[PDB]
Structure formats: C-alpha cells, structure tokens
Amino acid sequence: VIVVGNGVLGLSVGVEIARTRPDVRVTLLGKPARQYGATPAAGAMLGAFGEVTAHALASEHGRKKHALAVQAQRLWPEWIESLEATGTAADGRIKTADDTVVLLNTVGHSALDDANFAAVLTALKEANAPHEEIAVESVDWIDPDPNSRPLRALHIEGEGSVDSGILLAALERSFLQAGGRLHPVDATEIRASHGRVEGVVTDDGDFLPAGHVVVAAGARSQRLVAALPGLAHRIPRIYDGVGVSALVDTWDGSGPATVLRTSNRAFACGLHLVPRAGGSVYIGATNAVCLEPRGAASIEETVFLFNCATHQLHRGLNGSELRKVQVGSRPAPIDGFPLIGGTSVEGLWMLSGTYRDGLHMSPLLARHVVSLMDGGTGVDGLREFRPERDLISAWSREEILDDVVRHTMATGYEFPWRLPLEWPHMMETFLQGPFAELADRLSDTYTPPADLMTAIMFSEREQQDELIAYYADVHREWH
Amino acid sequence: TDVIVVGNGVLGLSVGVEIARTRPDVRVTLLGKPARQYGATPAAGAMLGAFGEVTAHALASEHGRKKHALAVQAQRLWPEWIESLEATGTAADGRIKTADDTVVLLNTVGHSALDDANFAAVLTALKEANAPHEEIAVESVDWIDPDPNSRPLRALHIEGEGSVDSGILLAALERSFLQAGGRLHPVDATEIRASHGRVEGVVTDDGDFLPAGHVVVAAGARSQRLVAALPGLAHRIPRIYDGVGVSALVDTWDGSGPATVLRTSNRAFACGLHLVPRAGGSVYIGATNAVCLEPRGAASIEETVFLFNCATHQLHRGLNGSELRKVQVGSRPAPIDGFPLIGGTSVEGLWMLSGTYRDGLHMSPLLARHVVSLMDGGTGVDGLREFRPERDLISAWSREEILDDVVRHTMATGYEFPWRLPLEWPHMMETFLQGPFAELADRLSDTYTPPADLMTAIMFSEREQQDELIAYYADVHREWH
Amino acid sequence: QTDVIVVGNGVLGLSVGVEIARTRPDVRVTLLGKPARQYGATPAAGAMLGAFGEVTAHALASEHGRKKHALAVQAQRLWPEWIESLEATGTAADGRIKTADDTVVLLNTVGHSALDDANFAAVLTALKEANAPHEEIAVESVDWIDPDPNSRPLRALHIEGEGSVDSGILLAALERSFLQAGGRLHPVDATEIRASHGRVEGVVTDDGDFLPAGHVVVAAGARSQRLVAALPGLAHRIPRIYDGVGVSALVDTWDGSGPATVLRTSNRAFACGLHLVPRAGGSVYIGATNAVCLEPRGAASIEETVFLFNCATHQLHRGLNGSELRKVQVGSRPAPIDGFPLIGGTSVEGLWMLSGTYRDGLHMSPLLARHVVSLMDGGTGVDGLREFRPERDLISAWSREEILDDVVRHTMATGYEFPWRLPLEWPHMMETFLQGPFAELADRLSDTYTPPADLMTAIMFSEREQQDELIAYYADVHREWH
Amino acid sequence: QTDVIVVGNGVLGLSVGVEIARTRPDVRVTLLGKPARQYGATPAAGAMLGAFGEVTAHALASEHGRKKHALAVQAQRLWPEWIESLEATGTAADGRIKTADDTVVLLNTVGHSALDDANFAAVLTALKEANAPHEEIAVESVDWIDPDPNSRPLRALHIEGEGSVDSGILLAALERSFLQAGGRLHPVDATEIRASHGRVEGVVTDDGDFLPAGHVVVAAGARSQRLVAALPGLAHRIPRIYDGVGVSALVDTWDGSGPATVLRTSNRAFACGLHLVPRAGGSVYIGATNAVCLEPRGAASIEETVFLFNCATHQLHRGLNGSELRKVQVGSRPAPIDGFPLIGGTSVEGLWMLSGTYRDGLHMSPLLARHVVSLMDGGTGVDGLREFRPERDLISAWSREEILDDVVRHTMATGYEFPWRLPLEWPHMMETFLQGPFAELADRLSDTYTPPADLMTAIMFSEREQQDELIAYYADVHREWH
C-alpha cells in the first residue's frame, strides 16, 4: 500500500492501515516542508456545530455532511488516547480545549451571522447536544472593543481543539510504531494499466510498486488522478482554498480556556482563537479560492485577520508578539463536497476535497476508506461523496446567485466599512446582473458554489473559457 | 381666592386643568406665550416612559427606586386622563395617544458599561413588577431597516408603555382648561409679589399687576430664577439649569411609520435614541441632552448630526432619504441636586412644580393631582413629600459614585459616535480623565457634589462660572448648616 | 399693448425688471411672484460671485464651457457699479449687498483626485491665461479656518476681486430699485401665457385675473419651461428645465466671528461643492448640496443636512460644530436638460425667456439682464449668448462616451467626499460594475440625445414610468427638429 | 599588543573594521559577532541614505540637532566613493549596493499638521540653505504610486543624490572588503572587556576564550553601553542606550514592479515614518515603526504590523494589498537616553565606542568610521563630532517645556496617523488632559535631566519599579558630574 500525501488525512489512513493489516507493507510519501499544507496552518477546531450555517442545513447534501461531523466528534477521545499512548509526557498534549464559545457581534452581515447563529442553536437542540446560551458578561478572558463586542454567546460542551502540529508529530510516531515506512519524496505520476494500479513514480526518478494507492495529497489530489485515461472529467476538480492564520505570544502569557469563534463568514472565512500550550494562541482564518496555488499570505489577509482578532476577541493581542504567519491550501472541491472512496481503477482510492473540516473528520474518513479496502461498506452516509461522479448540484442557480451577492456584501460589513447609507442597496442591485451573466455563460446545467464563483468572476478571460470547456466536457461524459 | 399658574408647559396646564375642574369656586389664570420660549413640552415626542427610563445607576439609589415607583403609578392614570381631555374636543382635533407599546433595542453603538447594564436592569425591573413584556427575535421587529454594522442583536417588547403627540396634548390641555372656566393670559411673569410672608400676586412683562392668594410656578427651567428674587430664597430653592434637547420631525420617504415606540436605554449624560410615531406620514426622532448654565433656543450642528446619524444607522436607513420638516429645541428643567421641586414654600400660597428633567410630561397627571391635593389641605401622593422645593441640596450619591459615573459617561460619548481609535487610546483617556474631574469636585465644595450631567457642563464652563458655583454651594451650606 | 410682464421674482426676474423699468420710463412694467418664493434658488444662495472658482477641467474641455467661463469674467466687471446703483435707492439701515471682495480656494483629500486635483490645476491655469490677480499661498496664512487635521487643506489659492453678496439684501435692493424706477409688484403667480396669431396677449394669474401685455419675460426659475410649453408646438421646441435642489444653512458662530474672504473648494460630485460665504452680524452661510430631481422638492433630506454639516465642520472650522443652526435653506437651481441656459427670444413675438442658469444665474444676472433688454430694444446684446436661444433642438456638447466616463467618476466621487472607509479593492470593483448599467441606460433613452451626468444619475434612480416618459420626450424632440 | 578588536558586526562595526584593515596593514584587526545578528538594526533597514529626508523642525531648532544634520550632509558626500571602493572587491554577480539615486518626500493629511506641515517646510528650507539639488514637483508626475484618494499626497519633493542601499548586499560587501584587506572574522560574542591601570588588555568571548588587544572599538548596537558600563566608574559616565525596536517588511509586488526612487514621508509620531525603498527582483522594502523599549524585543507586535501595512497600502500603493508578504523584519535602533550618539574615545586608553546612532547610523557609517580611525591614529577626526564623545554628562538639548509640548503633540499624532475618526471636540480635550500627567512625570524623574519625547512616552507607560530605577539612575549621573 502507498499513501500519497502526509497531511492529517494521509497519515490518519496510514496509521489505520498499518494497525489493521500487520501483514501488508504501507509506505507514505510527502516531504517535511508540507508545501501548501492545510494541516500545519490549522488551529485546529474539532468543528461540528460551530461549522453549521443556515445555507448548509438547507440542502440535503449539507445535512448529511453535518451528520458525519457529529459522528466524527464521538471518535476523537479514543483516537487521541491511541495516538498519545505511542509517546511520552514531553511530546505534548494533542487536545488543547474541551469546549467552544460561539460569539455573535455586529461586525458582519445580518443575512449570514444572524441566520447562522439561529441555525447553530437549532442544530444543537435537534441533535440533543449539551450547550447553553450564556450572558456575554460570563465569557472569561475576552476584552473586545465595545463597538465590536458580542451581545450573544453560546457555550458548546465537548466541541474542542487540537494542536495540529502535535497531532502531525503523534500520527507520524504512531505510523512508525505500527510498522509504516515514511519515504520523504513526492509522487509525480500514478501507474495503471488494464484498469489496475501498478504503483507510483516519485520525484527523484524512482518507481515504487503497489496493489493499493490512496491519494490524500490535499489540493494536488485530483490533478494527480486526472492524468489516467478518461478520469479528467470523472473526478471533480479540487482548487486551493488559501488560508492565513497566525501564532501569537500573548502580552501576559494567558489564553482562553475554550475555543472562541464566530459562525462562518464571507466565502467561508471566519474568526477564531484556538488555545495552545506555553503562552501562545492560534488566530485564524482567512479563505480565498485560487485557481493556482499560493504559498504566501497577502498584506490584505494579514491585516483583516489581525484587525478582527484585536477588535472582536481581545485588544491585548494588539500589544502581543507575532511569532508566525501560516499559509495552507484547504482542498476546495469544484462541486463543494468531498472526494472519498473507490475509483473505476482497482486499488485506487481518494481522500480529499474536505475544505474546512478534513482534520475534524480524519478518524471517521480513515476508518471508512480502510473498511472499503478490506471489503466492507464503511460508514453509511459517505456513499454520495464517492470520488468518481458527475458534479453535484446541491443548490439551484437562483440560491447560489443570492448567496454570492450576500457574501460579496458581507466582505464589506466584516471590514467593517463606513459608507453613505444608500450605497449598499445600490451595490446589491448592480452585483446581481454581472454574476447572473457569468453563471449563464459558464454552463446550462452546472453552477459553481459562491466561494468558487467569486474567484472565477475576478480571474482572466482565458481561465473562465477553460472552465466553460471543463463544464461542457463533464456534461458530455455523464449526460 | 384667585390662583395664578406661571407657565404653559404640560405641568402648568395640567395643574391648571385640575384646579379649574376641582375648584369651581376659585378663579384660575395661566400665564405664558404661544412661542413657549425654551419649552421642553413642544420639543418632546413624547414617550410615556416608566420601564424604558430604567437604568442600573437610577435603581442603585433609594431616591431613584422611589422615582421609578411613581412613574409606574403615573402610567395607570394616562388612559382616563386622555379620555377626559379628548372629550372636550371633536374628531378633527386628532388623537393624543400615538402608540400603546414600546420596543427597546440593544446594539453595540455605545458603552457596554451603560447599554448592557441598562438592558439587564430594564428586563429585571419588568419581571419584579410582573409587567407584561417579551424578549423577541430582532427579525420579528416590524419596519426597522438598520445598517447591519449598527443593528440590534436583542429586542424587548413592553406592553402598555406608549407615546402621546406632545402638540395635540398641549392643544387638548388648553381647550380643556378654557372649558372648565380657566383664563389664558398670554404674557410672562417678571416678578412674584410677597409681603408679611404671603403672595399678593404677579407683575407681568407688559407692566400690569395680577392679584392672587395662590401662585403655582411651573415655568420649566425659569422656575427657580423667578422664586429666588424673594428674600432668603436664593439659597433655599435649589437651582434649575437648562437640559437642552434637540429632536426632529421627519416626513418618511413612503409615508410609513412603526406601530410601536422604538428606543434604546438612556445613554451618555441622559441622552438617548428613540422614534415616536405620529399621524400623517411624520415620525418624531430624539433626543440629545446637554446641561447648559445659560439657556439656548437653537440646536448646535453637533446635536443635529449626532441625532440624524444615530436614527439613520440604528433605526431606519430610509430616514436618510426622508424630508426634514422641523428641528425642535427645548430645555429639560435640570435641578442642581438631580431631584424635582414639587410642593409648598415658606411663603403662604406660593407653590412650585418643576425640575422634572426627562419625565415631567409622563408624570404630569400624578404631579398635577398631588399639588392640587396639597393646595386643598390634603397630603397628595406619598413619597413626593421628599421633593419639597424649599430644601438643602440633596446628596443621593457619594462623590466616588459620581466621579466613576462622569468618566464612564464621558467615554460613552466616544462609543456612541461611534469613534474609530487605536485600541490602547480608550484605556489611556479613561486613566487621564479621573484626575481633572476629581480635582474639580474637591474645588467646588467640601460637602456638595453635582451629578454627572451637571459636572461635565461645569468642567467645560468658564472660570468665572465655576467660581460663581463655588460661592453658590458655600452660601447654601451657610443657610442650612 | 406696450405693457411688460416679468414672470418670476428671483434675481433674474427682478434684475431684468429693474433694467426694463430704468431703460423704458414710457412703458408699464409689472413683476409677478409671491414673497414665499416657493423653490426659490436665489434666497437659498450665499452667494459667491463665482468666475474662476467655478472653473472645472470638464467645463474648459468643451467649446460651450469655455464661452460660459468668458461671460462669467465679463459679468464680474459689472458688479461694482450694479451694487452702487442698487444701494443708492436705499439708506444705511438696509445693509450692504457686498459681503466679501476675495475668495480662497482650498485643496484637501476629502474627495476624488480625478475631480479636485484636475479642477485645482484648471483654476490655476485659467487665472494665469486671463492674467487675473491671484496668489498660491501657504495654508498656514489662511485666516480663521481651524479644520480637522485629517481633513485639512495642503494647498490654498487667494483670488482678488472674486467675492460674495448677501442674496437676501440683494433681493430687497432689487425690489426697492424696481419700485424706484416705476415698476409695479403684483404678488401672484402666472398660471397661463395667452398668445394668438403668433403674438403674446398677456398672462392669466392664479387669482383668476388677466393682465394684458405686448412683452412677457419668463424668469420663473425651474417652472419657466413648464409655463411656455403649454403654447402650441413649444412642448418639444423649448428644452426642459428640472430642479437642481440645493441645501445650505445659516449658522451663528460660537464667538460671533467669520472669515474675511469666501472659503470654497472646486466643484465636486454632480456640481455640489463646499463653501462658506461671510454675512454681517455674527452669522455665516454654508453650502451647498446639489441633486437633480424630476419633480420639485421644498425640504432638505437628512442625508443633505448631515453631508453639508460634516464637510463644513471638518474641512473649514471645527468651531462650527458648537455653533447654533439658525436656518436650513432649500432652493431649486434651474437645471436645463441639455446643460445650457435658455436666454432670449421665441417664435412668439414679445415672448422672452431667462432661465436654466443652474449654478451661476445670480453671478451673471447683471450681464443677462442687459442682454435680454438689448434684444427687446432691437439690439444684439452680448456676443456669445446667441447660442443659448431658448427655442432650439437639445444641444449635444459632449459625446456619449465623455458623459459615461463623467457619471461613473462623479458617482465614485460621492464616496470619496463622504469620506467612506472601504477595503482597498472595493472602489475598482464598483467602478467596473457601474459602467454597464449607465451605458445600457444611455442607449435605451435615445439614439441621438444623451443627458449630462447630473441629470443621468437622477434618471438612473427614477421610476420606470418617468424613464419611459423621457424616451417619449427625446423621440418627440427628434421628430420636431430632424 | 597593537592588535585591534571590533566588537559588533553591524554596518558600524564592519565599516570601522574595513577602514582600520585598509589604513593599518601592519596590525591584526579581529571583528566579533554571529551571523544571526540578534536584534540587529542593519539587516532590518531598507535602507535610506537619509540626510534631508530626516530633517524635522524640532531637530533644526536645537544647536545639538543642527550639528547632527551637518554631519549627515557630510556623510552623503562620502557614499559614491565608499560604494565604489566596496563594489571593487567583488564582481557583477554579487549585486548592486545602490538601489536608488533619488528620494521623493510626500505630504498627505494622514497625520498631524504640527509635525508633517512644519517638517515639510523645514526640509524645503534645509535643502535651500545647503544648496542641495531638489525640486517641488506635481504629485501627478510621481511614478508608480497608486494611493487611496482619501490618503493621497497633495505636495511632493524630489531630492537628487539622496538614495538607498540594499542593507543585506552592503553587509556582504563590507565582510568581503574586510577579508580582502586582511581582517579576521571570529563569529563569537564579547561577554566582557578587560582593562587595568586605565588601559585595555582585550576581550573575553562567549566560548570562554580571551583575545588580547591594545585597541577595542565597541559597535555592538543597543548592547554597547551595557558592555562598557561594567568597567569601574563608567556606569554613570557613559549614557545609557535603549532598544528603538523597528518593524519593516519585504513584499513581492503583485506585478514585480517597484518605484525608481525612495518614497517617504517626513518623520512622524515618536520617530516612526512611512517609506518604500526599492530592491532588485520584484521585491520592495516597506518601513518603519519605532518604539523605545526598556528591555530588548526580537518580534513585531500585531499593532506594528497592521500600522505599517495600513500606511503603505493607503498612502503609497493599493496594489501592495494584493502583494505577497515575504518577511517581517525586527531590529533595535540604538536609542541613547539623551538623544545623541556615543562616538569617540574614553578615559580608558585604546577603548573606543561607536553607537547610539538611532535612525541614521547606517547613513553616517563611512563618516563615523573615518572619524574613529583618525582619533586612533593620533588625529582629531571630523570637527562637529566633539559634543558626541561617549564619556559625558547627559546632554540637555531642549528645555523641559519644549519636550512636554513635543510629547503631547507626538501623542496626538499617533491619533491623526491611524487615522482615527472622533467627535470634533475630543482632540482639544485630550490635548489639555495630557499636559498634566507628563508635566508630573518630568518633575518626578529629576530636577535637571528630561528624557526626550521618544523615551518619555516609554517611561510614562512602564511599571513603577522601572520608573523608580530611572530616578536612581538620573540622580547617580548628577552625583558623578555635578
């Protein structure tokens, strides 16, 4: 078995294969640099209820994704214990907090933040999850700017955070202990003939043979499998959801006891603080879908992240020391849903397109793919997210066009801007036309979700035309 | 016996109506001109504020918990009082009542130390009095279309807390006064005449003299200045200053209006944002407050901008494109010790009804019946005895409480703008404000401390005006100790 | 008859009335209009005697605009004698018409570079070309001003002999001077002009009466076209005049002081601008907003009052913040649909028009008065004003392309003038998304006529019915003239 | 021993090392310091060759300040030959030290009038007095810049022959030139200077070793005083040097472009400032914040990064918003407690100091190098450097009154530079309430010494213990010298 990729998904599937099949040799590719790596840039939140939006819980596909995340939450306590057990006290703790506080402030669009706070509260009640709406005065540690302060707060029990760096170290250590082999090179090419995997050509010229290849190369995953015959239009494209976060040494070495977060905001960005050991905090995180990868933060992203954290969470962060600006690529699937499971090629498996919550879902997704590889059926509701599929259409064109305009306006309210009071209504009405025109021009059947549509809108004419050709070719293959 | 009421505000006319109806024996004359120079009443929306007027700082003093209780009592008189005033007119005179209910909104365009504390205090006071009310989803508040960055995140529906049209109320009081046999004489009192400790009557500003055995002073912010001319009384009747207030009448873009009063809790130095409905495609928006040591009859640019910016962002962006019909200015009678001047004097037949600051209009029917009862040999309403006009200045708060209050409220003028500052600046201004206000309080008197609303005015007044107040405070101490 | 009726009691009506009465003592001159001056531009004006201050790059780029500038310089030379001739009919207690001799133009960054930077250069250039006396001065040397440092000027321009009048005292002096020269004030409004066999008979008034005349001069500001359009054929031969609604304010200064000069910026988004005109007695005038409306409006909007007060308190003097508001003023600048005045004779004998002066009718009043009087007496008046004859095809002084660039720039300028605070990529996004809807509107309205920017923004945000009515108007005008 | 040890591998250490090695081929010159350059000012610098750009009205109002300005003009004349002499020891592929020949100073309103307006005038005046070539230019003529119109400049000043170096390539060229002239690099730190009978013996290093020498030049940036103060009596005879912590950034421009000149403002609140220094290969340098800290700090604060990035994206180029951040840099400007450098000889024979250069050590390096070398060789070096001898009483270059005006103005300037938005009466209120607490602090610290504004603000917001320690220091210095 060859696992291509050394993120949380690659290492999590590698650990589960190695522990479950002591008979077989499991090799994991990827370099310690983790170029464009989502995982090292993550806080990370074990986000289930925190990730709830009204827009997600309005599609069937979205209610399924939410159910899996609740399931994944139940595996974390044992999974952590099983990974910490292969190390000692000095390797540090994977778990960084047990609980999450969701804050509602007015530094954002009512049509996102108000709707999403209600949707979160509703989803917690429906799943009988333990939680409490609390007085903002009772939230410890936070010292916001009064003009940016929260007026409602929501304590969620058993929704916490891990140190993504210590998790990666624990997965690697646990992989070696169970007999896995780390080979620090990149796959250039997957070899297949007569509908079967032969193995993987590596970037130092070598060839490794295998009967099983699991692709978990984050945002590079589809580009790798698409080179095989016919698969270019049968595996949905994955783009880079570029994300900026930061490590900060607090002025007084303090930190909050819980995760602090807002609901998801414009184009699936969001404001959160994840606690860390040793007088550090994690703050994140921006999101921008890019058609080409990018390994460095923009000035705009750094300023936005720091302005939100200092005003909405703690003014003390203003006088605190910046240790590190982190950048990673959320694997952003073109149809807004993960690529998990088997292929029309025997022994070829895919584990990618997890966007915001691959890390959270890692233990569930790992056990699902391992079960499928062993002749089982894995977890029930994952069937729809099979990697070899027609692009999913989870929303009407009309729903997406309302969403893209709302989210575009939300980039204004989140700044927050100060405008003449008639300007917002004028921009609302003048945004509808150009986005309606773009959607009609791209395809008669497929509509990109908002996050991707805004990226396409501000891309070059050549990049747009290439997407028209892609969408048309996918329609030819499937309809 | 002749009665003269000096002043044609809600208090003067309300006491006039109650005297005329209750004492057909006596001839009652009411002074004051249709211009109503500095008049608080014509500038008022006005809200029938009881629970809406609740602040943590008010409900932390004994004197404040009493004032709150009276306001609940006054609310119960309004339905019959309105019916009794509307009955003397016809359909074409219009309705006094403009709304039955109030929605209190909480947004972040203000200080947490005022707006958060005051929202909790209101919710607590409604539960304690078992008053009908409901915390409601903001999405369910009709009509409002705020700027999302200025929007409310909590709303509170209060049943039976409403509003009157102050202009139609004044017209109904005048009409009801004439009907019950009162006489309107449209001149101003210049001087009250007394000898051998008894009122003889009133010299008017056209040179005339009207005799009377009873004179009720309800001249709003001019009330103390009028009585202080009599011997010894300069330091025995607490001073009343002008709480200058700006409001506006707006013709809405589409002729619509909210069905309820829309308001925030009280804000920096007893200002606040509210919209009171009106008939005929108009709304009232108010209202600023600034205590001034001299009267002022015109709005400042700053006040108009602040009022319009708050209403357009926090209540309805449609007000931005709406037509300004009228900018209104009136003087809230602001008593130097923060409590009303209601009742009898050391001079026989001399009565005072003033210093009501924010809520004289709301309390008018109760205050009217109280003074009328005292005039007829009764005891009126319990606990209004404490606000007798001839007294030593009251000390309802420690110097320490007021200095915390004045700094908090000063910072609140920043958060209400709202300003945008570097994040360390507010803490720096907080610490550098304490000293100058502590220094001012120590310099003014060893016993008396002005409440916050007045202290900020004194801080930014001239050196001569400050020294004159040191002499006033010292002279009051001499008289009473 | 040989009777003259002037319809309208603004600066133009009263100025033409005074010149007729003084020049024709033989004939009876009657002037209509009420003391309320409903929608009156003149009482709402500061007013600036604007020539060089009114210079924009966009104006000095069209032929029609370079002509307008030349007339304004000419009008400036008449003001000293005109004032003396009006003050002479009164006494000391009637007060002074002139309120300042000089103007300072300020450049700050509370606005669009594409307007304020270009227009400051255009003003400086036009002063040098005309050899007019002026000096670029240190901002530190500008007396009185106390701006917010973040809104302060970094360049200032002193213009000698470009000053201001009190519009109220001017109106009082014109009325008094009209009576003195033998004119009669009849305080009613004209409802209808009577003509038959291509000749004026007179005017039906709003109290039911009929006044006969051989001459009718229409100077009814923004109501002027609506009045003449009722005559046969003239509906599509006299270009429409709309209301350029303007808000200004009288303020009693905190300490009773005022600047010795006019203080102003160059003209800004959609021909608004910030200025302070001195007044006697501890008052200043601040103005002035501009918004073209398809229907008249007699009350300021909240938005206009806030914008005017925010600009004055930040850009001129923070002391205005603590100063007392005496009066909010509203008047209608007569806004001609083709962006040029309506001055002179008609196809109807004895019917004359004096309107569509937009921002500078008051400044040009003495010149315009003498021009119309000269035409009435068989002369040719002033040379370049023949072009602005009221009975004409709509003028096309700019290409559709020039106007579409202008309307987008000016729209963005309403942002920079607020001033807004936005993420840095938002302005470029709004620029590109504004082009399409305005290009679409211009193509839909007519294949030949394009409204100027000030009017196009008003049409863009008007109702569908009002837009369709304008398509019918433009088409009917094309039918009449082509 | 005729051995020379230079302690420190910044621009000053390496510049004095190069000049000693080239001028004394007879003697062994050894230079200490590690390639990490912990807290190193030089690697964090753009850097500007700032003479006229560094001019403030406040500097040119003291005698001590006019002297400092004169030295900077002198240093400018040495740069062309100094660069040629350093580039000559390498080849084309080592890169160019010079990154621009010229500087544009921009004036915008995103700041205090009392600093930016006064400092623009002071710069223009100082250029004329020194007969330096320069021109006030139209802002429209400044290449490359694309500011936010609300943050744009309205005046610009082109300075010829005031340029920039790549601080990294300069360090590489100094090292190369040092080895070429026979110098020896020993990459350890000095822990202690050895002296007995009033003479230097040598230097104990941080790996336990001892290097002997007859000459020790201390150029250890902000660590320089702490090192020499350990010798007897010198604790109160060498003025303290604190860390002027500075944040800058390397940015890869969206399109790989860069300006042809340095772009800068005048110096702003507490000696911060906005500048862009060009670099080769699609990079620009942006800087630079300043905060005097009583303890060293090796990491930027969130506040510093946000302020630097907000100023650059609004005031210079909006394209920087979408550009990639390559590196956030932090270095310690050596901040002398009396606001003047420590350059020259000591009461200890063979002990020399070269530090406390704050903002312009790099610029002055060639002059300061030649001065110390001349003193070491029995000469008098450069004339106006005498006052800045390292062993001295604290200088009092300003009255307490001048500093208290300065600290309040600069404090307010942190507001206007944000830029904040407040109610218009708030600034005057904070001005009057700031005077008291700073007057109280100054009186409490000493009856004779007053810290300059940059240091006073740091002391004001430090702990009570740190303040009391400064009262003891000031009192001990008074005891020693009076």
Ligand SMILES: Cc1cc2nc3c(=O)[nH]c(=O)nc-3n(C[C@H](O)[C@H](O)[C@H](O)COP(=O)(O)OP(=O)(O)OC[C@H]3O[C@@H](n4cnc5c(N)ncnc54)[C@H](O)[C@@H]3O)c2cc1C
């Ligand atoms: C800023 C940020 C914040 C986040 N916050 C959260 C959070 O709060 N909660 C949460 O649950 N999740 C969070 N995530 C992560 C999210 O869940 C992602 O979907 C998840 O990390 C994806 O994991 P992955 O292993 O598929 O990809 P990655 O983490 O990108 O790992 C893929 C690896 O494959 C390597 N690779 C690429 N090409 C090759 C090749 N040819 N050969 C070999 N190796 C190759 C890459 O270098 C990389 O190391 C965050 C991500 C980002 C960027």
Ligand SMILES: Cc1cc2nc3c(=O)[nH]c(=O)nc-3n(C[C@H](O)[C@H](O)[C@H](O)COP(=O)(O)OP(=O)(O)OC[C@H]3O[C@@H](n4cnc5c(N)ncnc54)[C@H](O)[C@@H]3O)c2cc1C
């Ligand atoms: C806010 C503002 C500021 C200005 N500032 C300046 C400035 O600084 N400098 C400058 O040169 N100019 C200024 N102007 C004015 C500009 O020059 C105008 O072009 C000029 O005032 C037009 O004068 P008018 O007499 O044509 O119209 P108006 O002044 O509008 O007078 C027309 C009069 O006719 C009356 N009328 C209407 N219908 C009838 C009828 N049927 N019968 C009789 N009478 C009727 C109206 O009620 C009104 O009183 C300003 C205008 C405004 C609104």
